[PDB]
C-alpha cells in the first residue's frame, strides 16, 4: 500500500524530472 503509492509517486517523479530536465518549465 504506502510503499507502492510512494514507489508510484517516485515513478511519476522520474517522468516529472525527465519532462522538467527537457522543458525546465517552458
Swiss-Prot record:
Gene that this polypeptide is encoded by: hld
Classification via InterPro entries: Delta_lysin (IPR008034)
Name of the protein this chain belongs to: Delta-hemolysin
Subcellular location: Secreted; Host cell membrane
Pfam families (UniProt xref): Delta_lysin
Organism: Staphylococcus aureus
GO biological process: symbiont-mediated hemolysis of host erythrocyte
Similarity annotation: Belongs to the delta-lysin family.
Residues passing through the membrane, by range: none
Keywords: Cytolysis, Formylation, Hemolysis, Host cell membrane, Host membrane, Membrane, Secreted, Toxin, Transmembrane, Virulence
Chief localization: secreted
PTM annotation (N-formylmethionine): residues: 1
GO cellular component annotations of the record: extracellular region; host cell plasma membrane; membrane
GO MF annotations in UniProt: toxin activity
Function, in words: Lyses erythrocytes and many other mammalian cells.
Amino acid at each position: 500500500m504506502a510503499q507502492d503509492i510512494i514507489s508510484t509517486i517516485g515513478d511519476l517523479v522520474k517522468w516529472i524530472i525527465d519532462t522538467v530536465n527537457k522543458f525546465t518549465k517552458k
